[PDB]
Symmetry: C2
Subunit: 552 residues, 2 copies
Amino acid sequence: LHKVSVPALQYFFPIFHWGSDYSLRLLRSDVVSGLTIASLAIPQGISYAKLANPPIIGLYSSFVPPLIYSLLGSSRDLAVGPVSIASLVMGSMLRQAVSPDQEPILYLQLAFTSTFFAGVFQASLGFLRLGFIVDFLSKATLTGFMGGAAIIVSLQQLKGLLAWQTILMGVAFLAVLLTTRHISARNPKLFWVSAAAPLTSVIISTIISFVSKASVIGDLPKGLNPPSANMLTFSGSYVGLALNTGIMTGILSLTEGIAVGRTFASINNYQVDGNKEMMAIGVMNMAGSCASCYVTTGSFSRSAVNYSAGCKTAVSNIVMASAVLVTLLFLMPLFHYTPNVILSAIIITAVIGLIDVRGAARLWKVDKLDFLACMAAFLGVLLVSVQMGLAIAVGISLFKILLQVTRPNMVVKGVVPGTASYRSMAQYREAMRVPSFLVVGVESAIYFANSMYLGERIMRFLREEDERAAKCNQCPVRCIILDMSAVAAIDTSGLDALAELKKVLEKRNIELVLANPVGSVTERLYNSVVGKTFGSDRVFFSVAEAVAAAPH
Amino acid sequence: LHKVSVPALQYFFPIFHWGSDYSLRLLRSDVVSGLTIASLAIPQGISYAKLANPPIIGLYSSFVPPLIYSLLGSSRDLAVGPVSIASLVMGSMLRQAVSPDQEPILYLQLAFTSTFFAGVFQASLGFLRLGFIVDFLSKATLTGFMGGAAIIVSLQQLKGLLAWQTILMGVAFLAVLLTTRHISARNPKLFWVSAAAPLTSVIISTIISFVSKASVIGDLPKGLNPPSANMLTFSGSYVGLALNTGIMTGILSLTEGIAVGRTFASINNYQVDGNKEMMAIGVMNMAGSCASCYVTTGSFSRSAVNYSAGCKTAVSNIVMASAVLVTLLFLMPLFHYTPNVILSAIIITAVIGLIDVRGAARLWKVDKLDFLACMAAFLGVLLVSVQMGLAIAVGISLFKILLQVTRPNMVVKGVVPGTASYRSMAQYREAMRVPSFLVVGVESAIYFANSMYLGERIMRFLREEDERAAKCNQCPVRCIILDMSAVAAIDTSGLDALAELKKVLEKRNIELVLANPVGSVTERLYNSVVGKTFGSDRVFFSVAEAVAAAPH
């Protein structure tokens, strides 16, 4: 038998850590990325600024929030700026109380007060180490949401329509934007045809608007960021609208640049701090909200072209905000004859690409609580508002976690012949039961949610095999072993029901035995008063050493 | 190596099942119980009817709801009638919109419409098999609630006070009601001094109100149940008050008679159906709400005197409702000189007994999320209303379940010397690591909540022991084994991150191996397209057969 043993300019500003080893060979590589990601910020930061209902606010949002993150950030391949989902939800939740055609100085004061409050929601969630709650946003919630929101904005934008040289132009240069996605989904080296097809859609349609001169978006104001917080309306009537939009774009614009600092960390093996990562983007917003920026966070699309044309570190986040230092000042009069429809298919390719219909139905034949969540975020945004299509699909994604912790699986086990290892009897048809014993595996953690369910379930198996004992004249159950290998945690109410089970099973001379615990259980089983009534003679190394010791 | 194998008058009316074997020796025993439980329904059904703010409504509620449950119920020692907690919450949530001294025909129409809607909430939660959600009500939530509600009713009842023969009488006959609880908490055979001290408080103080004749409660209306639903106001202004009271007393009056049909089932080994058990009490109410009954469910106190004076089955639930058939008709003129204070210490003993201060602080030194839940139900009922003292303490009791599924414990393991069993290295200081391997145990289920956390945590241990490999010139990690013994479940998003981990670990020649799965994982690992990329050469019987097979 074996004994069950029991067990400041570099903290705040992390550019100084990795900045002391930047080479020229790296600087050969973090410029051809940031020539192309500052070729996808110029037609897809003015395009999803249109989707939020002015087009230069998406370019102010590609200069200072990339520069702030390069000082405070903890990834090196996360590339920043605006995104596509947060802009659409910004453009829907604000269109249905104000209108940018009617109150354009009060539509600019609401995509700023939301951004500042999408700044403190992302900063002071990661400052108080509370950034695990961005993981509750499942992949099936966001398939339902992004796709149940890409219809009710397709109605609100098609109420603003109610020409032959426009609609025959905006489908052919959408075809340079969807066939370059058909051919970039096949080969993961043909990103380069899609890495500038947002730019060669604009530039080739610039000259056809320059030789056929005259609904163009025109002369945009040359200059730096306007110093806002003179357009931050903290004290007014539209604050709840600019707080609900800043909560709702403070989660949709967090789970895209938290979950891209994780999917580009395991590829390259650098630990991204998560909560210190969340502190950065909440200073990308609330300290960028005063500089004509709206809600920014790292993109899913303009990161997988940063690490597809070989980025090496986060100075390609400065080649972002230094080759945008150029274009806000010099090529703005070239933008005077750049049309509106050419950047509206750039919205459209991030609408049809938002309705992932295959993944919307693939999760029907493999699960049916990650399918109810899709069709509760689908019909929760179509029928109820945007805030309740997310609240009831997170809420039934959190339910299938609770529906397995309540009512878990308790198997009956038995020794697999030829070895001293006790597996279940649902699997392993050949597994034999020991006559004087009963092995029962609790396959979840023992909480208040299921402490009273194990007692009513162990004594169903124990009742099952005291009436089956008389059928073959066998020895009945004289030791029930709890294979606690699968029990992850135990609380005070789960540890109590293990002591109210021992003294019920003592009154039938059954001798309940725990076997094979884990860490954070044995330090609760040997440091509480509900544990020294178990002690060392009922907590074993494995089942095979509990059967061998034979507690009787 | 071993192969990982993969796997109508008796349905509705259950008195006919156990009714065919009732003996006279049982009928000797289910009458001395039901002489005493119909001696605790008469002074504690009129007493907690006062706590809900007429005293005969608690006696109508001890005749027909015990009779309906004896037909539809699935326990035999659960004894029914009103309770103490649901009455207090009924008397608080209705006092703060109407007043029974001012609108007594509209206070009787609101402790009925609530009961009917505490009838369909308990019936049509167990009819749709949804009765696991009564387990979310933790024992620490109810310590905070019952005790954070027994103050704000102690203020509302002490606004109705603002004599020498009353207050000198109501403390001495509270002392016959608290010292009989001091002596019944010590010896669990001295229930009999407390089994009639609620009745010998009333009957001995009857004659001292009969020789000192004259705030007495007096002549109560003799007769059967009045046939209500002429006092059910489905269509009015006070329906939301009588729906919030029927939701809130449809959970507090469910977790007392679900959780007593479970704690009196494991003692006696009879399987109580739970959802069919929940169907009964929701017909004890919504089909009893038309017969002058308020919200009834099995008691914690009048069940542990039913099974302390030897009950045998649920005809002691008819000796309840046939020895109450007597007393509603014959001893009612004896009740004419029965005082009000004698049944108000019967309220008081279920107030000081509600403030379990020891258990309110015992869960501080053993846990601190089952202590935050007490002091969020404490200050959630004192400051916010009754419905939010429960909503925010269930909500942070459900949080510690989610705070362990998000961010679980991943241990590093290693072979315990002398045996082929791989335990962790937090416990078992003597445990040795195999040189060419790395064993990592995932101690929770793999959900969307934590699929991206294992990848960022396995590659912290893998990074930990490739820099520690060069310190002692050892062989580095060439096989990472996932001891999946503790992984209870896996979803579609947790199974995907195990395939996005295999092909990252393939690109370093590391060969991720799952080992020792459970049921409801191997039927997902061998019946999905994310499983045949694993197959049979990466899903092993145990770790000791994965180390022995050596996948390289």
